[PDB]
Amino acid sequence: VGSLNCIVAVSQNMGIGKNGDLPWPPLRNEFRYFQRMTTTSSVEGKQNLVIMGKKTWFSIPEKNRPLKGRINLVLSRELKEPPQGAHFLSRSLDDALKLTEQPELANKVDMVWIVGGSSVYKEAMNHPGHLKLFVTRIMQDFESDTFFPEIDLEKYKLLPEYPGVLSDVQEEKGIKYKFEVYEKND
């Protein structure tokens, strides 16, 4: 498997969700970026793996599940099989990664993107080795009930730039946001 990456949209107050949905009104271009990042594979004939916790899967509108063109893995210690529309179920993040290594997912998957939620991020983030964080900074405060964990800037470096990622402040529905890329190697 290729690169291990995390992707998240965060408010100023570090919020990522409120009552099973996003704290802000839907930003279509933000969603378009998330689609593009997570779906594009750096290698022909391969596909990306999207790993998400159970609540994340159920918060995605049904019309949008499973995330098309990607292998959809749901994490849960309570499900007996993958939910309707999902491809794989794992009981922990290491089994999800161990499975990428089964000759089955082997060489079909180039990259694996953690798309949420809190617990999954927190864990990927402390995971050892090379990891990139694609962070959309939502430049305002939004009442949230779920939060993104602290980024340790002694380990994660903000990159000056990245191919395919706009460096300019974006604006939509009068909300300003910016895209950032962080990298770690420990």
Ligand SMILES: NC(=O)c1ccc[n+]([C@@H]2O[C@H](COP(=O)([O-])OP(=O)(O)OC[C@H]3O[C@@H](n4cnc5c(N)ncnc54)[C@H](OP(=O)(O)O)[C@@H]3O)[C@@H](O)[C@H]2O)c1
């Ligand atoms: N703004 C954004 O970028 C963004 C990104 C994603 C989600 N969201 C929002 O954030 C919220 C969902 O967040 P969340 O943190 O509550 O949910 P989550 O992490 O998606 O779901 C937590 C459930 O997932 C399973 N799980 C999670 N981590 C696991 C692990 N390491 N091993 C095994 N199972 C694990 C457990 O399922 P069992 O209990 O079944 O064991 C746990 O109850 C929703 O509001 C969603 O709308 C926002």
Ligand SMILES: N[C@H]1N[C@@H](N)[C@@H]2C[C@@H](CN3CC[C@H]4CCCCC43)CC[C@@H]2N1
């Ligand atoms: N940058 C970025 N990081 C992500 N991981 C994102 C997860 C996406 C998952 N979706 C699509 C529609 C959703 C409704 C409610 C909750 C979650 C939902 C939403 C946009 C994301 N953007």
